[PDB]
């Protein structure tokens, strides 16, 4: 708290307290840790000569560099006070000392328009034509290399430019590391008057007119894009200029002029030799309702969409002309409409030339902010609809998403006739495990959905299932109890998908827990829905190991593997395994529910669960043998047989063995 008192004293301009603290023995060369500012740096910055003299008196170091490598002398160029420069100069080894990005005191005087300081630094040996030397990482991307002239041109300091060219012998056509000259920088200055003056000065002294800036634009193109007739005239006076040069996108100055409704600029370019073959200029001028330009122009002369459902319209949208909204191409017409929304709608779009679905909100919409906020945090979530980005025009927030084919509701309806009635539903399993992963990672990211329902779940070309509608999402830290509403709706969605869309979601929403459970067609489904209604943060990832997600072959495999334990086969009643299994079921009296034929042959068995497992293992191993042709024909597919006959068996075994060493008999599962 000695040098910290000094620092605040210098800021507040308290000179006597600075004297006292300096004589009490406080370090004048203290540099604060974050940005390396010293009291001297601060004194020069605040333009206070009394503190500068006082600090130097007590041995402040004028060679001291802050984090960006700037010294107090460099900073003095910024402030532009010649007296501070004079005072510091004797202690300065090199007047052209630079910071880590290449800035000298002279350059800073040019950037900040400090004329007196510029003159003083020139007279004391400043290199007027020094290029900024910078770090290796900057040089390798062609940054750095700018001069004082370029800076002064960019910032619109006409006086400085005049003086640099006339009194200080500045190189008019010097180039930075990207190949730009002062003329390019001059045309980036938004002030029209200063840009016009500086451009004339530069052109008069022989600035090269055929150079390139950003996007490989020429000075002529920059002048057209800025819609300035005078700058265009000025530039077209130079007879060496190349009027038909193209920017990186292949656009010529004429083409841009017609596109931007610049009639006079366009005529002037034609008269100075610009070619009509750069584009369909007539159609463009017509489109703009530039009647006179159309007459003048008349006188003087593969893409494939990925989406099947939306492909035809996507092709048409690619074909037509539209103005861009940042990276988005879109046209509000019924041909390109996907669906209604609360806020006017989902439309097809092209974003960075990728097909997308575009959800449109009012730019002030609270829900649009909820949607975009959640999507911005969910880009790593593979089971969430892929977010491309967003674009505002004046009024509408456009949220661009991966284009999907169908809603889960529509998808289930399209495929409702695929399966033979008691076929195993593999696709239900895949749909739901994606949703578990989606919702699980969404919660991990701190968000809750609030609206999980079949029309917010999207299926893509590859039959991938994605979670989609986040306009009502919330950060759950606010109200943790609302995470349970997601899990409940997920329970409903489990039944919805398992019933193949036959029972509407609204019907399911109007049922009690008990009724939902009673409406389930099997025990795996019942138990799973139970755990979602009574959870009750990796609950969802752990439930992927639940037997609802085990295939029928895997369930049958597990039963057989348990029925092969030596203690089951020897019927050792005091074994750990039979302990576990023997503690109101469909397999009570199981030997009577099996077919009469089958039971007799296998006997060449008691009503215990251990013996049922033993039975399943034995039948499993010997069912396909030639002697057992009749057995095989009666039972049919054995996994389906035992499950239909004993619906609670798989869940019962799972529950008894769940956290024992006999987990090893469960199938390999996701993790």
Write out the binding residues for Mg(2+).
451, 456, 469, 471
Q: Does 474 sit near ligand ANP (CB under 6 A)?
A: no
- Residue pair 95/85 in contact (Cβ under 8 Å)? The answer is no
- Does 551 bind a copy of itself (CB under 8 A)? Our answer is yes
Which helix (H) or strand (E) segment holds residue 328: the answer is strand 328-329
Cβ-based nearer residue to ligand ANP, 146 or 457: 457
Nearest-approach distance from CB 586 to a copy of itself, in angstroms:
28
Contact pick of 4, 204, 352, 595 for a copy of itself (by CB under 8 A):
352
Using the rule CB under 5 A, is 154 a contact of Mg ion?
no
| Site for a copy of itself contains 116 (CB under 8 A) | no
Instruction: Please report whether residue 527 would count as binding Mg ion according to CB under 5 A.
Output: no
Residue 534, interface with a copy of itself (CB under 8 A)? no
Q: Within positions 459 to 478, which residues make up the interface with Mg ion, using CB under 5 A?
A: 469, 471
Find out whether 155 and 161 touch, Cβ atoms under 8 Å. Answer: no
Distance of closest approach, residue 584 Cβ to a copy of itself, in angstroms = 32
How far is 300 from 277, CA to CA, in rounded Å? Answer: 12
- As a whole number of angstroms, the distance between CA 485 and CA 498 comes to 20
What DSSP assignment string belongs to 221-242?
HHHHHTT-HHHHHHHHTSTT--
The residue within the footprint of a copy of itself, chosen from 5, 89, 130, 178 (CB under 8 A), is 178
Q: Could you give the CA distance from residue 310 to residue 358 in angstroms, rounded to a whole number?
A: 13
Q: How many residues bind ligand ANP (CB under 6 A)?
A: 20
**Residue closer to ligand ANP (CB basis): 212 or 449:** 449
**Among residues 3, 14, 32, 47, the one that binds a copy of itself under rule CB under 8 A:** 47
668 scored as a contact of a copy of itself (CB under 8 A)? yes
- Whether residue 219 contacts residue 235, with contact meaning beta carbons closer than 8 Å, is answered with yes
The rounded distance, in Å, linking the Cα atoms of 377 and 190 is 36
Rounded Cα–Cα distance for residues 297 and 307 (Å): 40
> How crowded is residue 610: how many other Cβ atoms within 10 Å of its Cβ?
22
For residue 204, what are the contacts with CB-CB under 8 A and spacing of at least 6? none
Q: Which of 655, 664, 647, 648 is nearest to 580 (CA)?
A: 655
Number of other CB atoms surrounding residue 337 within 10 Å: 14
**How many CA atoms, within 13 angstroms, populate the side-chain half-sphere of residue 216?**
8
Q: What string marks each residue from 186 to 215 as x (binds a copy of itself by CB under 8 A) or -?
A: --x-------------------------xx
Residue 176 or 471 having the CB closest to ligand ANP: 471
Task: Determine what percent of the chain falls in helix, strand and coil, rounding each to the nearest 5.
Answer: 50, 5, 40
Distance CA 602, CA 630 (A): 13
Phi first, then psi, for residue 272 (nearest 5°) are -90, 15
Annotated binding site: 451, 456, 469, 471
404 binding partner (options Mg ion, a copy of itself, ligand ANP, none; Cβ < 5 to 8 Å by kind): ligand ANP
Considering CB distances under 5 to 8 angstroms, the limit depending on partner class, which of a copy of itself, Mg ion, ligand ANP, none binds residue 379?
a copy of itself
Quick one: 469 or 561, whose CB is closer to Mg ion?
469
Q: Which is nearer to Mg ion, 252 or 473 (CB)?
A: 473
Contact of 662 with 611, CB cutoff 8 Å: no
635 near a copy of itself (CB under 8 A): no
Tokens 């036959």 belong to: 502
The residue written with tokens 């639940």 in the block is 546
Q: Are 86 and 120 in contact (CB under 8 A)?
A: yes
Interface with ligand ANP in residues 389-448 (CB under 6 A): 401-404, 407
Residue of 119, 539, 569, 645 interacting with a copy of itself (CB under 8 A): 569
* 294-333 footprint of a copy of itself as x/- string (CB under 8 A): xx--x---------------------x-----------xx
User: Are the beta carbons of 403 and 472 closer than 8 angstroms?
Assistant: no
Under rule CB under 6 A, residue 346 binds ligand ANP: yes
> What residues from 315 to 344 belong to the interface with ligand ANP (CB under 6 A)?
338-342
Sole binder of a copy of itself in the list 140, 169, 482, 576 (CB under 8 A): 140
Of 242 and 382, CB closest to a copy of itself: 382
From candidates 36, 279, 344, 519, binder to a copy of itself by CB under 8 A = 344
Please report whether residue 538 would count as binding ligand ANP according to CB under 6 A: no
> Position of tokens 């002239």?
149
E-strand spans in 343-413?
Answer: 346-351, 354-362, 387-392, 396-402, 406-407
| Total Cβ atoms within 10 A of residue 505 | 19
Task: Give the interface size with Mg ion as a residue count (CB under 5 A).
Answer: 3
Q: How far is the CB of 77 from ligand ANP (least distance, A)?
A: 36
Residue selected from 395, 589, 592, 659 as contacting a copy of itself according to rule CB under 8 A: 395
Cβ atoms of 572 and 578 closer than 8 Å:
yes
Identify the residue among 342, 422, 538, 592 touching a copy of itself (CB under 8 A): 342
Q: Name which of 471 and 524 has its Cβ closer to ligand ANP.
A: 471
Rounded Cα–Cα distance for residues 488 and 535 (Å): 9
The residue behind tokens 């861009």 is 324
- Per rule CB under 8 A, is residue 137 in the interface with a copy of itself? yes
Q: Does the protein bind ligand ANP through residue 459 (CB under 6 A)?
A: no
**Region from 21-29, 378-386, 431-439, 530-538 binding a copy of itself, contact rule CB under 8 A:** 378-386
Closest approach, Cβ 494 to Mg ion, in A, equals 19
Through-space distance between the first and last CA atoms of the chain, rounded to whole angstroms: 54
Closer CB to Mg ion, 189 or 453, in the complex? 453
Alpha carbons 286 and 598: distance in angstroms, whole number: 86
Helices (H), 182-274: 182-188, 192-204, 219-225, 229-236, 253-259, 263-271
Considering only residues 363, 479, 515, 661, which one is a binding residue for a copy of itself as defined by CB under 8 A? 363
Instruction: Indicate whether 629 belongs to the interface with a copy of itself (CB under 8 A).
Output: no
Residue ranges that bind Mg ion, judged by CB under 5 A: 456, 469, 471
Residue ranges that bind ligand ANP, judged by CB under 6 A: 338-342, 346, 357, 359, 385, 401-404, 407, 455-456, 458, 468-469, 471
């Amino acid at each position: 708290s000695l040098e910290e008192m000094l620092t605040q004293a210098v800021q507040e301009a308290d000179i006597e307290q600075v004297r006292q603290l300096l004589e009490r023995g406080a370090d004048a060369n203290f540099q604060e840790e974050e940005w390396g500012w010293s009291p001297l740096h601060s004194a020069v910055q605040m333009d206070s000569e009394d503190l500068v003299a006082l600090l130097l008196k007590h041995g402040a170091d004028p060679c001291l560099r802050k984090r960006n490598g700037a010294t107090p002398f460099i900073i003095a160029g910024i402030t532009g006070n010649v007296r501070l420069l004079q005072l510091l100069l004797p202690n300065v080894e090199d007047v052209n000392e630079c910071d880590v990005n290449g800035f000298t005191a002279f350059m800073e005087a040019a950037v900040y328009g400090r004329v007196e300081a510029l003159r003083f630094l020139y007279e004391n040996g400043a290199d007027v034509n020094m290029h900024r030397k910078t770090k290796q990482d900057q040089e390798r991307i062609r940054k750095g290399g700018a001069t004082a002239l370029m800076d002064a041109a960019e910032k619109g300091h006409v006086g400085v430019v005049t003086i640099l060219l006339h009194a200080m012998k500045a190189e008019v056509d010097a180039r930075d590391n990207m190949g730009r000259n002062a003329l390019v920088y001059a045309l980036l200055n938004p002030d029209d008057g200063k840009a016009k003056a500086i451009t004339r000065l530069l052109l008069d002294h022989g600035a090269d007119v055929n150079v390139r800036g950003e996007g490989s634009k020429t000075p002529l193109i920059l002048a057209v894009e800025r819609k300035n007739l005078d700058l265009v005239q000025m530039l077209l006076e130079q007879e060496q200029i190349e009027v038909n040069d193209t920017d990186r996108e292949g656009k010529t100055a004429l083409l841009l002029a017609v596109e931007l409704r610049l009639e006079e600029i366009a005529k002037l370019l034609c008269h100075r030799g610009a070619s009509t073959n750069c584009g369909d200029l007539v159609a463009i001028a017509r489109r703009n309702y530039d009647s006179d330009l159309v007459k003048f122009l008349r006188l003087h002369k593969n893409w494939k969409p990925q989406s099947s459902r939306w492909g035809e319209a996507l092709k048409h949208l690619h074909r037509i002309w539209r103005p861009m909204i940042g990276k988005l191409k879109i046209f509000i017409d019924e041909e390109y409409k996907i669906a209604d929304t609360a806020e006017g709608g989902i439309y097809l779009g092209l974003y960075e030339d990728q097909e997308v679905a575009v959800k449109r909100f009012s730019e002030g919409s609270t829900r649009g902010q909820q949607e975009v906020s959640c999507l911005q945090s969910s880009r790593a979530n593979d089971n969430v609809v892929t977010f491309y980005g967003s674009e505002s025009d004046g009024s509408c927030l456009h949220v661009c998403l991966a284009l999907c084919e169908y809603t889960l509701q529509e998808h289930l309806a399209n495929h409702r006739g695929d399966a033979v009635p008691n076929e195993e539903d593999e696709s239900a399993r895949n749909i739901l495990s994606s949703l578990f992963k989606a919702i699980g990672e969404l919660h991990r990211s701190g968000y809750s959905h609030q609206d999980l329902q079949p029309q917010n779940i999207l299926i893509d070309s590859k039959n991938g299932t994605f979670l989609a509608d986040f306009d009502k999402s919330i950060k759950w830290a606010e109200d943790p109890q609302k995470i349970k509403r997601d899990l409940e709706a997920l329970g409903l969605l489990v039944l919805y998908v398992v019933k193949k869309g036959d029972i509407s979601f609204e019907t399911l929403k109007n049922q009690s827990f008990e009724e939902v459970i009673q409406g389930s067609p099997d025990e795996e489904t019942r138990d799973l829905i139970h755990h979602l209604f009574h959870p009750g943060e990796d609950r969802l990832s752990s439930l992927l190991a639940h037997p609802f997600f085990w295939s029928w072959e895997s369930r049958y495999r597990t039963l057989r593997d348990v029925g092969n334990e030596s203690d089951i086969k020897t019927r050792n009643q005091n074994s750990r395994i039979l302990q576990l299994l023997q503690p109101s079921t469909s397999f009570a009296q199981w030997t009577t529910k099996i077919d009469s034929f089958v039971m007799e042959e296998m006997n060449a068995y008691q009503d215990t669960l251990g013996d049922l497992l033993k039975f399943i293992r034995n039948l499993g191993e010997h069912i396909n043998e030639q002697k057992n042709k009749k057995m095989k024909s009666i039972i049919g597919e054995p996994s389906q047989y035992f499950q239909e006959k004993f619906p609670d068996l798989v869940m019962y075994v799972y529950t008894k063995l769940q956290n024992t060493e006999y987990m090893k008999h469960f199938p390999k599962t996701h993790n």
